[PDB]
Design a protein around this ligand. Structure first.
Ligand SMILES: Cc1ncc(C[n+]2csc(CCOP(=O)(O)OP(=O)(O)O)c2C)c(N)n1
Ligand SMILES: Cc1ncc(C[n+]2csc(CCOP(=O)(O)OP(=O)(O)O)c2C)c(N)n1
Ligand SMILES: [Mg+2]
Ligand SMILES: [Mg+2]
Lengths: 546, 546
């Protein structure tokens, strides 16, 4: 005790999760996990945060992982885990270190092949773990005898790859005896790679660094930011991995998005005589539909799974090790110019809100130490090109792209870092998939600033195909009235409807000033209105499907 | 004259769905399915009914299948299909004929291994179909060259087993040329079975029939009802398959649920000298936690996959064929007694609503031509033992048991049969998983009667374990205000809060009398209050988890 005044498998697991920095566990109870839940409740250093549904729990855990750099959620066998599998798939796709723990029937029930609830009534308790094979780095069915080694095996894999892992925990196994862990869970080619990077950087007249999502996966953002700061090297990111570095840096160019990039940025990146890519993956939504021009012959790329050193593929290295050794490199100093930064100002008028002006306003009015979360749709494509201020972060999901993700994810990330004010931009159509976590936000007294873009349906879809087709319409809810209906009082959530630029600036400033309440702001915009980037990208998506 | 002088694969699929009796398709759009969606919208013989999310779509299609006897829903590759997989799993477990169509990228994009949205950025477009293997009777990734062959193969499997099937439809393949279908979608073992059943019923002094969920799967309820009506044979069902026969039959005994059965029913079933089981599976929730006593030595059981004739296993037979020939059997009339019908007139008072009184009232007030839908929790436990009136049906999901299922499922079933008044009983905890389909119910102008049991959290869980544990609490929404907030007007949805027995009788009668609006009724019950059946199963589950 600070004042100076049987251990089980459940305790072992929770101890290991604590070691990973996890302070909150998400999910949904079921009879197959209640005993383990008791253990979570009893922890002084860990809080149960129950969700309305499992899909939302999985999304929330993903957002938490993006910020905390590890996460866990708990589901029940079959119905819980299968509800959550799309969330876990997104965590696999975008490489987030999420542990799913699945409570399962007792070892005896499983061995007896009983036709119990949440099964296919065939006596087989292994189907659902098999179904997770493509979306997990490691998976285990625990037994009393295997539990400590298996837990350590799968969580060690979480540490190695920062991809999701899966632990099936039978009821009787969680209560089984265990011994406390004795030890914590925590170079030639790597030195050759570093030497070639050093040589290349010092000989380059116009180097450029491109940072991506795998930097975020490993919590290497501050490391890369420090490296770029010290060396003055020009740096860009894709929108997949936005905020992999601090965007306030004088050498940060903007977001490279293939032919849809700002022209000076495009020209700079594509004329660089050496390119260092750190944790980047080139996807349709992050390359202007594969219209990038990045010359492999002038490139060293480093990824979790492999590196390419001027076309020579290598696999025998640790990504984290190499990236963290970059500031061992001395004497690198870029002495050239970057690109002209446009002056950021927003003066509101009484005009109705438009998409392009909205994102100009958000860019101006966003502060340091904030996290911007932006949903697939007009929100992602608008918010993705805003220059973030110092110590600010971004969460977007351009590879997996599962609409609805951002609402629970924003809440999870907000819980992970309560000192970073979260601003959520989510469309009406996307909010409808995951709205029920409003209850959690109220109960947990979270204070994010949430902007709901009511444009009367699926505007991004209208831009790709069928602008006046009925399937792009959705039932219109009274979005501003949701918090009240879900149990919020005025001292917890402030709700607003905003139609004009003046109203937007007033409410945004009001929200930013008032750090002790959540803001729920319904923005009204025209269905035909799309930000410039999406007007272009919509047609490229359409072309990709021809 | 005085002088003497483009049908496509998408069309083919939709024509086949029409053949199955499907008039509505559920789901959620995405760029990979929008062009196929145009084809649905253009159909005169079926309607697109867009959902808020895909999990709910899959639930809705399941409910539709239970009543319509076939169903389909449409998702987008990766994100849509994985969101829906828990619903499809439930359709597999409880054997409902649901077709999931997944719109996927063009074959060129798939063949090139492009890192496109809704993938793991590994160029592999086959992971998600593989993940469906354990929960689908058949599956296909269509090509232009195999499309009609594969559609017919998988839909023929749906007709054979009445289990869910899966069709991945690439954008370019749906638009590919096709020819209209040339053929329509379509022994001694069976004679021996029928002869042995006939013989056994002739020799029995006290036969009992047990009908189960596979009767519902094949749309054989009327067939079984007719057979039982003609022969006067005693019949029971489990709660798994409730309404597999019409419960208004003179020879219908009630629900057999192991040692939790009503005593005279239990005694009758367990002393029967011959047992004929039709489409039954014995599961924990449907056997009083495996406390049934059904002697295989006195039993012929018929299932879709298997028959057991006095311990002798048979496979080579058509379940539907055999059941449909039962009325051809001769000399099998039952001339004995059944069990006594207890009667008490329900007399309401001003007393606050309690669980056992609630279900007493519902039994007294339920009418012919209704479908009762009951969610896992106190609703299922209470509602499952109500005697249904003539031409009335029941939907519950005791094997898969995915809470939230029943709200979209009730709406889907209600769309499937507009002439059966659906009464939904769903708990507060469960409604929170799937509440967003309230928008669809308003748009489609459905008129179900919905009862939301507000008992301030997960009462069934409190009965299993941890009655005062915080994980059994949920954020309390203002449930009665949901329709207004989701855009309903008073000409569409009537919302009420009900606290007393008098209020309940008044509102239920009011609801039943007003066929032209939807009713949204918040029932207030105490968290500690459980129906008498649950006061028993609560413990049995707890024991099962020891
Ligand atoms: C789970 C899931 N279902 C469907 C899609 C396809 N999809 C992408 S964007 C989009 C529309 C989003 O609309 P909204 O949130 O209203 O954004 P807007 O463009 O109108 O601002 C849809 C349906 C998806 N990406 N994920
Ligand atoms: C998808 C899913 N998650 C979790 C469970 C476990 N579970 C079974 S019943 C139940 C509680 C349902 O509570 P409620 O709907 O409020 O019913 P009641 O209070 O009337 O018992 C839970 C969480 C489940 N069956 N399915
Ligand atoms: Mg919208
Ligand atoms: Mg409840």
């Amino acid at each position: 005790h600070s004042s100076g005044l049987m251990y089980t498998v459940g305790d072992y697991l929770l101890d290991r999760l604590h070691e990973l920095g996890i302070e909150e566990i998400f999910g949904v109870p079921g009879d197959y996990n209640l005993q383990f839940l008791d253990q979570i409740i009893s922890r002084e250093d860990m809080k149960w945060i129950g969700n309305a549904n499992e899909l939302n729990a999985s999304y929330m855990a993903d957002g938490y992982a993006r910020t905390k750099k590890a996460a866990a959620f708990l589901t029940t066998f079959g119905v819980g885990e299968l509800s959550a599998i799309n969330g876990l798939a997104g965590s696999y796709a975008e490489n987030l270190p999420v542990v799913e723990i699945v409570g399962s029937p007792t070892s005896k029930v499983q061995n007896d092949g009983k036709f119990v609830h949440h099964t296919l009534a065939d006596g087989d308790f292994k189907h659902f773990m098999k179904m997770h094979e493509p979306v997990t780095a490691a998976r285990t069915l625990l037994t009393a005898e295997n539990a400590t080694y298996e837990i350590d095996r799968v969580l060690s894999q979480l540490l190695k790859e920062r991809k999701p892992v899966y632990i099936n925990l039978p009821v009787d196994v969680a209560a089984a005896k265990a011994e406390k862990p004795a030890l914590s869970l925590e170079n030639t080619t790597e030195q050759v790679i570093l030497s070639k990077i050093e040589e290349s950087l010092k000989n380059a007249q116009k180097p450029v660094v491109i940072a991506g999502h795998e930097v975020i996966s490993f919590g290497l953002e501050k490391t890369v930011t420090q490296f770029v700061s010290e060396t003055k090297l020009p740096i860009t990111t894709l929108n997949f991995g936005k905020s992999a570095v601090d965007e306030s840096l004088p050498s940060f160019l903007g977001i490279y998005n293939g032919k849809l990039s700002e022209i000076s940025l495009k020209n700079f990146v594509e004329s660089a005589d050496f390119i260092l890519m750190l944790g980047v993956k080139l996807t349709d939504s992050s390359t202007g539909a594969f219209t990038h021009h990045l010359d492999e012959n002038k490139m060293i790329s480093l990824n979790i799974d492999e590196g390419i050193i001027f076309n020579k593929v290598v696999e025998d290295f640790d990504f984290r090790a190499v990236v963290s050794s970059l500031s061992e490199l001395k004497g690198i100093e870029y002495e050239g110019q970057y690109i002209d930064k446009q002056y950021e100002e927003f003066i509101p008028s009484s005009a109705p809100l438009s998409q392009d002006r909205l994102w100009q306003a958000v860019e101006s009015l966003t502060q340091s130490n904030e996290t911007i979360v932006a949903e697939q749709g007009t929100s992602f494509f608008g918010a993705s090109t805003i220059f973030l201020k110092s110590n600010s972060r971004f969460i977007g999901q351009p590879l997996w792209g599962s609409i609805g993700y951002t609402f629970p994810a924003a809440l999870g990330s907000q819980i992970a870092d309560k000192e970073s004010r979260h601003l959520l931009f989510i469309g009406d159509g996307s909010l409808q998939l995951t709205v029920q976590e409003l209850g959690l936000s109220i109960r947990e007294k979270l204070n994010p600033i949430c902007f709901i873009i009511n444009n009367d349906g699926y505007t991004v879809e209208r831009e790709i195909h069928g602008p006046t087709q009925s399937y792009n319409d959705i039932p219109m809810w009274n979005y501003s009235k949701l918090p009240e209906t879900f149990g919020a009082t005025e001292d917890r959530v402030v709700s607003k409807i905003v139609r004009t630029e003046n109203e937007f600036v007033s409410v945004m400033k009001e929200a930013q000033a008032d750090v002790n309440r959540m803001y729920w702001i319904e923005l009204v915009l025209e269905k035909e209105d799309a930000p410039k980037l999406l007007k272009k990208m919509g047609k490229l998506f359409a072309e990709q499907n021809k």
